[PDB]
Amino acid sequence: MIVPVRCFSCGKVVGDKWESYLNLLQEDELDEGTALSRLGLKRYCCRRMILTHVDLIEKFLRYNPLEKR
Amino acid sequence: RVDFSARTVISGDPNLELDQVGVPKSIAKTLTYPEVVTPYNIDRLTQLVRNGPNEHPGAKYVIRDSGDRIDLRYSKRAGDIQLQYGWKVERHIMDNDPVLFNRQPSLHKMSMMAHRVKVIPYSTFRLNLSVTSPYNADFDGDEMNLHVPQSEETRAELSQLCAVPLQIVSP
Amino acid sequence: MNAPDRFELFLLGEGESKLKIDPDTKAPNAVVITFEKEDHTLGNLIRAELLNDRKVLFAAYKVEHPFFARFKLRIQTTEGYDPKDALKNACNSIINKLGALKTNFETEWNLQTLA
Amino acid sequence: NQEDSMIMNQSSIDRGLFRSLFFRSYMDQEKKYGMSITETFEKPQRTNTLRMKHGTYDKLDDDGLIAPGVRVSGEDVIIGKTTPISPDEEELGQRTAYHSKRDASTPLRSTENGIVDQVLVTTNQDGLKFVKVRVRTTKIPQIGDKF
Amino acid sequence: EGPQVKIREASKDNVDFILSNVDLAMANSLRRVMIAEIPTLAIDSVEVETNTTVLADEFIAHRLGLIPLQSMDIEQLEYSRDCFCEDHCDKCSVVLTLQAFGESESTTNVYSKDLVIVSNLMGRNIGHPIIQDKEGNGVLICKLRKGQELKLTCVAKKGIAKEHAKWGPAAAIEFEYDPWNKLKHTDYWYEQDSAKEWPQSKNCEYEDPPNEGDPFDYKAQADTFYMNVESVGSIPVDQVVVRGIDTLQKKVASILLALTQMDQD
Amino acid sequence: LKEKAIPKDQRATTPYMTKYERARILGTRALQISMNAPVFVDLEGETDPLRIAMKELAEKKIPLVIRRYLPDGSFEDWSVEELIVDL
Amino acid sequence: TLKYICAECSSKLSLSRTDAVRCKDCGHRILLKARTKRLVQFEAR
RNA sequence: CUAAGAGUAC
Ligand SMILES: [Mg+2]
Ligand SMILES: [Zn+2]
Ligand SMILES: [Zn+2]
Ligand SMILES: [Zn+2]
């Protein structure tokens, strides 16, 4: 849905490394492994947290709000 | 269809004895056994009545000799109840209660053996690994049923004829 | 539904104490101490420090069920040596060792320049 | 973990592994039993209502519904509906001529609970009001769940 | 005299050291205590005034409870269970408040830098969410379309990782001993040659390799452990180790205290 | 009933108590104890009716008799006193 | 009176029992009841 | 109430 705050296995905070990851993939044209290593994710438990995330929140945000102020 | 029965998922427990069965706490609170008030057990039955039905161990009903049934819910308003010899306290099943234990595709006698209650704090029946072979039961989602005897004769014959150790060698 | 509260893993319940000692009738000069709201963390440490003792003939611990936070420690010492005294000495040695370790780590950390 | 059991990490569950949302919807309509025997969504009153359920009616507001955000437990009434009946019947000891309405409420499931997520009011094909109440709860993995 | 320590790497969030002249039980107990026995501050109760986002209320509450908060002076705070207030007060909690609105035509990201501490801290050093990245924005809490609003108030208490993993300060702790397998505590699985098929650990450089002809040393015990503690951010990484040692010492001292107080009765 | 009752001097059944006979005797005696029947043995602090009946059976103080029915309708009366509880 | 929101206008409409269930801006017949005012308590666990 | 469908463990 949205990026998890912490790695399930060890508990490292990965919730603040999502936008940087997308920026590295887009602006710097890095591949996924180098981008994950650049953010400091060295254990594969954290690498699977960031690498396999599906950011469904954008699809939800495409619909108009039910209660608009 | 019968009363005083439960059904739920089963999980294995290496820390239970062969003839023990782990019973979820809520199931133990729902199912009850009627114990006749006797001079030998007046104190503990009184204590269970004082504890009430919302906490385990406790009693859910008091069956008077006149047939009137005092529901322990809404009875704390009336105050403490004095028990008389010959009354019945319908109380939560505690440890070491003989209970019949079954897995429904019951093809032979050893699929309906009798266990001893051990109250546990989760939502699954817990049984020894070795006893799963006569039941033909795995832990991939199997459900099993529990029947509580309601008298001293049925309790006695359930412990003395259908007990798990007595069924180790099959005919 | 039936899941117990997590604070029961470490908070002492009402009406129960941290330790309870029962004499052991199997062997002479042996006791069984039940520790409540404890786990392998303390049990393994206490067991190892007791086995370091020279007048302890037997020392073992076990957690009977993972559901409940408690464990049992059986201690048997030589004649004329109270098992409670052996437990006291084991705890004192553990505390001294931990204090020395903390001092050593603080001194080593204070020497860092890239921290 | 013998016999197809599994050991799941408790700390990983605490951090959000395999957590789920569950939504359940209850639908109810007011129906024209006759020309002017229309059912009405409302909060039933014990003074003039029959067959009121043992669950609490406190959580219902004026229009016989529950505003989203209110916690509801088992057997609590979430839709309050009443139907007109023939008056002037005396029985049961506490039934007088005032009991001119029969309770047709919809309680929550006896085993489930959660927060009321969204209630929706609209009109059916015939033009009669009907409602849908959606309740949200959180399923956290525990001993007995299948994976 | 006693356990000796020599640290290889010191960083802001990692410390890599050697723990020699100590029993295996002591090292493992220290590791366990560091994992799940050090008190920490984390959000525990959430009051949702307004939520028109696309996420559920308890979804956002779960995310908020996982936000690391500063816990340097958490020893001054008291547990809510042993405080005399009704629900929460200044002596046992920290009150933050999140208030975000989607006034921009594009998506607005609600980060953890937007959390505001409302209750007075009485000069302590607790409460502030930990910020690590270079942009300055903390954990991405939520996202807002135009016209959506999120207003809520959080109460944070102190707790340990046993009650919930959100209070854990320690992340992953590397623990190794005897890199050369001289104690024969493992039997290496292999197909052709176990030495070629099992990669050497990085710690093998710190011990003398076996001579390959000497007899097995049956009197040798296990010591000289290699450990690496990482910090989530709530407390500095050295404080994790120091407070773990302190907590283990406190537990042993409490055992002594109970023994002595029931000895005198 | 005079014709049915096999005389005691020529009973032809086993002198050993069967498992079902023992189970029913224990159940019956425990049920009677639970309903305030007099106890024929001295209690050592036991309160469970089943174990009280077990103690009564161990030293043969249960005043009941089994009426074993033969398939033709005849019966033999075996007192619990004279039945050998080998099992 | 009690408030509702149109499904496709997000317009607040207070309605009584005798009022016809419709939106006064577009005529839409689907209305969502407004959020409750009483406080809601969540355990962050 | 009846009917129908999807199932779970054998
Ligand atoms: Mg199966
Ligand atoms: Zn990780
Ligand atoms: Zn306080
Ligand atoms: Zn509209």
mmCIF file of N, CA and C in Angstrom, chain B residues 38-123:
data_model
loop_
_atom_site.group_PDB
_atom_site.id
_atom_site.type_symbol
_atom_site.label_atom_id
_atom_site.label_comp_id
_atom_site.label_asym_id
_atom_site.label_seq_id
_atom_site.Cartn_x
_atom_site.Cartn_y
_atom_site.Cartn_z
ATOM 1 N N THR B 38 -21.468 -31.216 48.134
ATOM 2 C CA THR B 38 -21.186 -32.257 49.107
ATOM 3 C C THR B 38 -20.406 -31.642 50.258
ATOM 4 N N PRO B 39 -20.508 -32.202 51.467
ATOM 5 C CA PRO B 39 -19.655 -31.717 52.565
ATOM 6 C C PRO B 39 -18.172 -31.713 52.249
ATOM 7 N N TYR B 40 -17.718 -32.545 51.312
ATOM 8 C CA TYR B 40 -16.297 -32.604 50.995
ATOM 9 C C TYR B 40 -15.840 -31.507 50.040
ATOM 10 N N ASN B 41 -16.757 -30.820 49.355
ATOM 11 C CA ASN B 41 -16.367 -29.831 48.355
ATOM 12 C C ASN B 41 -17.173 -28.543 48.476
ATOM 13 N N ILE B 42 -17.687 -28.246 49.669
ATOM 14 C CA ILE B 42 -18.515 -27.058 49.843
ATOM 15 C C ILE B 42 -17.683 -25.788 49.702
ATOM 16 N N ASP B 43 -16.454 -25.798 50.223
ATOM 17 C CA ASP B 43 -15.642 -24.585 50.240
ATOM 18 C C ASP B 43 -15.244 -24.153 48.835
ATOM 19 N N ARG B 44 -14.710 -25.077 48.032
ATOM 20 C CA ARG B 44 -14.229 -24.687 46.710
ATOM 21 C C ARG B 44 -15.384 -24.353 45.775
ATOM 22 N N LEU B 45 -16.512 -25.051 45.911
ATOM 23 C CA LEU B 45 -17.685 -24.698 45.120
ATOM 24 C C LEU B 45 -18.208 -23.320 45.503
ATOM 25 N N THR B 46 -18.198 -23.005 46.800
ATOM 26 C CA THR B 46 -18.571 -21.664 47.231
ATOM 27 C C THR B 46 -17.634 -20.623 46.636
ATOM 28 N N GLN B 47 -16.331 -20.910 46.632
ATOM 29 C CA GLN B 47 -15.368 -19.969 46.067
ATOM 30 C C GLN B 47 -15.586 -19.773 44.571
ATOM 31 N N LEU B 48 -15.871 -20.855 43.844
ATOM 32 C CA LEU B 48 -16.146 -20.727 42.414
ATOM 33 C C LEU B 48 -17.403 -19.907 42.166
ATOM 34 N N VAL B 49 -18.429 -20.091 42.999
ATOM 35 C CA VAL B 49 -19.634 -19.275 42.866
ATOM 36 C C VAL B 49 -19.315 -17.808 43.127
ATOM 37 N N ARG B 50 -18.478 -17.536 44.130
ATOM 38 C CA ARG B 50 -18.078 -16.159 44.402
ATOM 39 C C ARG B 50 -17.329 -15.560 43.219
ATOM 40 N N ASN B 51 -16.459 -16.350 42.582
ATOM 41 C CA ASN B 51 -15.696 -15.846 41.442
ATOM 42 C C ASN B 51 -16.604 -15.480 40.277
ATOM 43 N N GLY B 52 -17.669 -16.244 40.059
ATOM 44 C CA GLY B 52 -18.621 -15.938 39.022
ATOM 45 C C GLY B 52 -18.244 -16.520 37.677
ATOM 46 N N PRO B 53 -19.022 -16.192 36.647
ATOM 47 C CA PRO B 53 -18.829 -16.793 35.322
ATOM 48 C C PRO B 53 -17.920 -16.024 34.377
ATOM 49 N N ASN B 54 -17.501 -14.810 34.725
ATOM 50 C CA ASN B 54 -16.721 -13.989 33.809
ATOM 51 C C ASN B 54 -15.222 -14.231 33.904
ATOM 52 N N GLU B 55 -14.759 -14.973 34.903
ATOM 53 C CA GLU B 55 -13.342 -15.248 35.065
ATOM 54 C C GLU B 55 -13.145 -16.735 35.306
ATOM 55 N N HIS B 56 -12.028 -17.263 34.826
ATOM 56 C CA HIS B 56 -11.765 -18.686 34.983
ATOM 57 C C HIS B 56 -10.713 -18.901 36.057
ATOM 58 N N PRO B 57 -10.893 -19.864 36.968
ATOM 59 C CA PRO B 57 -12.036 -20.778 37.112
ATOM 60 C C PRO B 57 -13.234 -20.143 37.808
ATOM 61 N N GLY B 58 -14.436 -20.609 37.498
ATOM 62 C CA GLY B 58 -15.638 -20.051 38.086
ATOM 63 C C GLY B 58 -16.837 -20.889 37.707
ATOM 64 N N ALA B 59 -17.996 -20.477 38.211
ATOM 65 C CA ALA B 59 -19.245 -21.186 37.988
ATOM 66 C C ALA B 59 -20.186 -20.343 37.143
ATOM 67 N N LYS B 60 -20.957 -21.012 36.286
ATOM 68 C CA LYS B 60 -21.927 -20.330 35.437
ATOM 69 C C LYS B 60 -23.358 -20.411 35.952
ATOM 70 N N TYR B 61 -23.722 -21.464 36.681
ATOM 71 C CA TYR B 61 -25.092 -21.615 37.157
ATOM 72 C C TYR B 61 -25.098 -22.288 38.521
ATOM 73 N N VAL B 62 -26.200 -22.116 39.244
ATOM 74 C CA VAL B 62 -26.449 -22.862 40.474
ATOM 75 C C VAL B 62 -27.827 -23.493 40.344
ATOM 76 N N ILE B 63 -27.872 -24.815 40.263
ATOM 77 C CA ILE B 63 -29.125 -25.549 40.145
ATOM 78 C C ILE B 63 -29.580 -25.927 41.549
ATOM 79 N N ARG B 64 -30.656 -25.297 42.012
ATOM 80 C CA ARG B 64 -31.219 -25.596 43.317
ATOM 81 C C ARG B 64 -32.014 -26.897 43.275
ATOM 82 N N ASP B 65 -32.248 -27.464 44.461
ATOM 83 C CA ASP B 65 -33.028 -28.693 44.556
ATOM 84 C C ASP B 65 -34.469 -28.483 44.110
ATOM 85 N N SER B 66 -34.989 -27.264 44.253
ATOM 86 C CA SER B 66 -36.339 -26.954 43.799
ATOM 87 C C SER B 66 -36.452 -26.885 42.282
ATOM 88 N N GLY B 67 -35.333 -26.912 41.559
ATOM 89 C CA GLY B 67 -35.326 -26.818 40.119
ATOM 90 C C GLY B 67 -35.044 -25.430 39.583
ATOM 91 N N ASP B 68 -35.198 -24.401 40.411
ATOM 92 C CA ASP B 68 -34.846 -23.053 39.996
ATOM 93 C C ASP B 68 -33.352 -22.965 39.723
ATOM 94 N N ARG B 69 -32.996 -22.201 38.700
ATOM 95 C CA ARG B 69 -31.624 -22.109 38.223
ATOM 96 C C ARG B 69 -31.142 -20.674 38.391
ATOM 97 N N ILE B 70 -30.204 -20.469 39.311
ATOM 98 C CA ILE B 70 -29.655 -19.150 39.594
ATOM 99 C C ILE B 70 -28.542 -18.889 38.592
ATOM 100 N N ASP B 71 -28.757 -17.915 37.714
ATOM 101 C CA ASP B 71 -27.746 -17.512 36.749
ATOM 102 C C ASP B 71 -26.762 -16.583 37.445
ATOM 103 N N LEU B 72 -25.481 -16.957 37.453
ATOM 104 C CA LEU B 72 -24.495 -16.169 38.186
ATOM 105 C C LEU B 72 -24.276 -14.805 37.552
ATOM 106 N N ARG B 73 -24.535 -14.669 36.254
ATOM 107 C CA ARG B 73 -24.685 -13.339 35.688
ATOM 108 C C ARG B 73 -25.985 -12.740 36.198
ATOM 109 N N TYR B 74 -25.928 -11.479 36.619
ATOM 110 C CA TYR B 74 -27.036 -10.722 37.190
ATOM 111 C C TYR B 74 -27.397 -11.191 38.594
ATOM 112 N N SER B 75 -26.658 -12.143 39.168
ATOM 113 C CA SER B 75 -26.937 -12.615 40.517
ATOM 114 C C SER B 75 -26.113 -11.913 41.583
ATOM 115 N N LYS B 76 -25.011 -11.260 41.202
ATOM 116 C CA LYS B 76 -24.229 -10.508 42.175
ATOM 117 C C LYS B 76 -25.031 -9.363 42.774
ATOM 118 N N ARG B 77 -26.086 -8.921 42.087
ATOM 119 C CA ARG B 77 -26.989 -7.929 42.655
ATOM 120 C C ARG B 77 -27.664 -8.462 43.911
ATOM 121 N N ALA B 78 -28.067 -9.733 43.893
ATOM 122 C CA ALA B 78 -28.719 -10.345 45.045
ATOM 123 C C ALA B 78 -27.758 -10.636 46.190
ATOM 124 N N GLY B 79 -26.454 -10.562 45.959
ATOM 125 C CA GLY B 79 -25.484 -10.827 47.002
ATOM 126 C C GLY B 79 -24.950 -12.245 46.954
ATOM 127 N N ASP B 80 -24.265 -12.609 48.033
ATOM 128 C CA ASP B 80 -23.672 -13.936 48.140
ATOM 129 C C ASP B 80 -24.747 -15.007 48.274
ATOM 130 N N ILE B 81 -24.483 -16.165 47.673
ATOM 131 C CA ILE B 81 -25.400 -17.299 47.680
ATOM 132 C C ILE B 81 -24.868 -18.341 48.652
ATOM 133 N N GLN B 82 -25.727 -18.810 49.551
ATOM 134 C CA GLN B 82 -25.361 -19.861 50.491
ATOM 135 C C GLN B 82 -25.714 -21.216 49.888
ATOM 136 N N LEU B 83 -24.715 -22.079 49.747
ATOM 137 C CA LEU B 83 -24.924 -23.387 49.146
ATOM 138 C C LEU B 83 -25.402 -24.393 50.185
ATOM 139 N N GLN B 84 -26.296 -25.277 49.753
ATOM 140 C CA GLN B 84 -26.840 -26.328 50.597
ATOM 141 C C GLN B 84 -26.495 -27.685 50.001
ATOM 142 N N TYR B 85 -26.270 -28.664 50.876
ATOM 143 C CA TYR B 85 -25.927 -30.006 50.419
ATOM 144 C C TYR B 85 -27.048 -30.566 49.556
ATOM 145 N N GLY B 86 -26.683 -31.103 48.399
ATOM 146 C CA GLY B 86 -27.633 -31.605 47.440
ATOM 147 C C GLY B 86 -27.883 -30.685 46.265
ATOM 148 N N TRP B 87 -27.501 -29.416 46.372
ATOM 149 C CA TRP B 87 -27.569 -28.520 45.232
ATOM 150 C C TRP B 87 -26.490 -28.871 44.213
ATOM 151 N N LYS B 88 -26.577 -28.233 43.054
ATOM 152 C CA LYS B 88 -25.628 -28.436 41.971
ATOM 153 C C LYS B 88 -24.989 -27.103 41.622
ATOM 154 N N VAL B 89 -23.682 -27.109 41.407
ATOM 155 C CA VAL B 89 -22.970 -25.945 40.902
ATOM 156 C C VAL B 89 -22.515 -26.292 39.497
ATOM 157 N N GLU B 90 -23.070 -25.608 38.504
ATOM 158 C CA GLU B 90 -22.703 -25.834 37.112
ATOM 159 C C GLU B 90 -21.552 -24.880 36.815
ATOM 160 N N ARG B 91 -20.336 -25.428 36.787
ATOM 161 C CA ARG B 91 -19.095 -24.669 36.856
ATOM 162 C C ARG B 91 -18.181 -24.968 35.674
ATOM 163 N N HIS B 92 -17.272 -24.033 35.399
ATOM 164 C CA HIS B 92 -16.345 -24.178 34.283
ATOM 165 C C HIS B 92 -15.478 -25.417 34.450
ATOM 166 N N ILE B 93 -15.193 -26.086 33.331
ATOM 167 C CA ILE B 93 -14.338 -27.267 33.365
ATOM 168 C C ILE B 93 -12.913 -26.853 33.704
ATOM 169 N N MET B 94 -12.346 -27.494 34.718
ATOM 170 C CA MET B 94 -11.020 -27.188 35.219
ATOM 171 C C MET B 94 -10.024 -28.241 34.742
ATOM 172 N N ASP B 95 -8.805 -28.178 35.269
ATOM 173 C CA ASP B 95 -7.772 -29.136 34.906
ATOM 174 C C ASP B 95 -8.147 -30.536 35.377
ATOM 175 N N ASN B 96 -7.643 -31.536 34.652
ATOM 176 C CA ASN B 96 -7.808 -32.951 34.988
ATOM 177 C C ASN B 96 -9.265 -33.405 34.911
ATOM 178 N N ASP B 97 -10.039 -32.808 34.008
ATOM 179 C CA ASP B 97 -11.399 -33.260 33.741
ATOM 180 C C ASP B 97 -11.395 -34.240 32.579
ATOM 181 N N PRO B 98 -11.973 -35.427 32.722
ATOM 182 C CA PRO B 98 -12.070 -36.335 31.575
ATOM 183 C C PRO B 98 -13.008 -35.792 30.511
ATOM 184 N N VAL B 99 -12.525 -35.672 29.280
ATOM 185 C CA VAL B 99 -13.336 -35.207 28.162
ATOM 186 C C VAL B 99 -13.127 -36.118 26.963
ATOM 187 N N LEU B 100 -14.217 -36.439 26.273
ATOM 188 C CA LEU B 100 -14.104 -37.212 25.050
ATOM 189 C C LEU B 100 -13.636 -36.317 23.914
ATOM 190 N N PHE B 101 -12.765 -36.858 23.072
ATOM 191 C CA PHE B 101 -12.106 -36.047 22.057
ATOM 192 C C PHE B 101 -12.103 -36.813 20.748
ATOM 193 N N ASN B 102 -12.570 -36.169 19.684
ATOM 194 C CA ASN B 102 -12.942 -36.870 18.470
ATOM 195 C C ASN B 102 -12.462 -36.109 17.243
ATOM 196 N N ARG B 103 -12.159 -36.851 16.180
ATOM 197 C CA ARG B 103 -11.984 -36.288 14.847
ATOM 198 C C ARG B 103 -12.990 -36.943 13.913
ATOM 199 N N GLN B 104 -13.747 -36.115 13.195
ATOM 200 C CA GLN B 104 -15.044 -36.530 12.664
ATOM 201 C C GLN B 104 -15.038 -37.733 11.729
ATOM 202 N N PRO B 105 -14.128 -37.881 10.764
ATOM 203 C CA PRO B 105 -14.131 -39.136 9.999
ATOM 204 C C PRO B 105 -13.693 -40.291 10.884
ATOM 205 N N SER B 106 -14.550 -40.650 11.837
ATOM 206 C CA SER B 106 -14.210 -41.587 12.901
ATOM 207 C C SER B 106 -14.435 -43.007 12.402
ATOM 208 N N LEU B 107 -13.344 -43.705 12.096
ATOM 209 C CA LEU B 107 -13.403 -45.003 11.445
ATOM 210 C C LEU B 107 -13.176 -46.165 12.398
ATOM 211 N N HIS B 108 -12.699 -45.903 13.610
ATOM 212 C CA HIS B 108 -12.458 -46.955 14.585
ATOM 213 C C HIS B 108 -12.489 -46.331 15.970
ATOM 214 N N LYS B 109 -12.444 -47.191 16.988
ATOM 215 C CA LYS B 109 -12.629 -46.731 18.360
ATOM 216 C C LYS B 109 -11.545 -45.746 18.777
ATOM 217 N N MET B 110 -10.298 -45.984 18.367
ATOM 218 C CA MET B 110 -9.195 -45.144 18.821
ATOM 219 C C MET B 110 -9.265 -43.720 18.290
ATOM 220 N N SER B 111 -10.230 -43.404 17.436
ATOM 221 C CA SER B 111 -10.452 -42.031 17.009
ATOM 222 C C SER B 111 -11.357 -41.260 17.957
ATOM 223 N N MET B 112 -11.771 -41.865 19.068
ATOM 224 C CA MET B 112 -12.639 -41.219 20.053
ATOM 225 C C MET B 112 -12.155 -41.501 21.470
ATOM 226 N N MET B 113 -10.885 -41.220 21.729
ATOM 227 C CA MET B 113 -10.305 -41.465 23.039
ATOM 228 C C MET B 113 -10.578 -40.305 23.997
ATOM 229 N N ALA B 114 -10.351 -40.563 25.283
ATOM 230 C CA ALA B 114 -10.653 -39.619 26.353
ATOM 231 C C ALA B 114 -9.372 -38.992 26.883
ATOM 232 N N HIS B 115 -9.371 -37.671 27.018
ATOM 233 C CA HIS B 115 -8.205 -36.915 27.452
ATOM 234 C C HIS B 115 -8.496 -36.202 28.769
ATOM 235 N N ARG B 116 -7.440 -35.637 29.352
ATOM 236 C CA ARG B 116 -7.523 -34.809 30.547
ATOM 237 C C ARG B 116 -7.362 -33.346 30.163
ATOM 238 N N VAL B 117 -8.203 -32.492 30.740
ATOM 239 C CA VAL B 117 -8.230 -31.085 30.362
ATOM 240 C C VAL B 117 -6.991 -30.378 30.896
ATOM 241 N N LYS B 118 -6.395 -29.526 30.063
ATOM 242 C CA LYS B 118 -5.362 -28.582 30.481
ATOM 243 C C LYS B 118 -5.694 -27.238 29.846
ATOM 244 N N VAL B 119 -6.064 -26.257 30.668
ATOM 245 C CA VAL B 119 -6.510 -24.969 30.146
ATOM 246 C C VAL B 119 -5.309 -24.169 29.660
ATOM 247 N N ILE B 120 -5.402 -23.644 28.440
ATOM 248 C CA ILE B 120 -4.295 -22.938 27.793
ATOM 249 C C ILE B 120 -4.786 -21.581 27.298
ATOM 250 N N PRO B 121 -3.900 -20.588 27.117
ATOM 251 C CA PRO B 121 -4.328 -19.240 26.725
ATOM 252 C C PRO B 121 -4.287 -18.928 25.228
ATOM 253 N N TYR B 122 -4.897 -19.783 24.406
ATOM 254 C CA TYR B 122 -4.973 -19.496 22.974
ATOM 255 C C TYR B 122 -6.221 -20.161 22.405
ATOM 256 N N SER B 123 -6.354 -20.140 21.078
ATOM 257 C CA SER B 123 -7.609 -20.492 20.422
ATOM 258 C C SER B 123 -7.603 -21.855 19.735
#
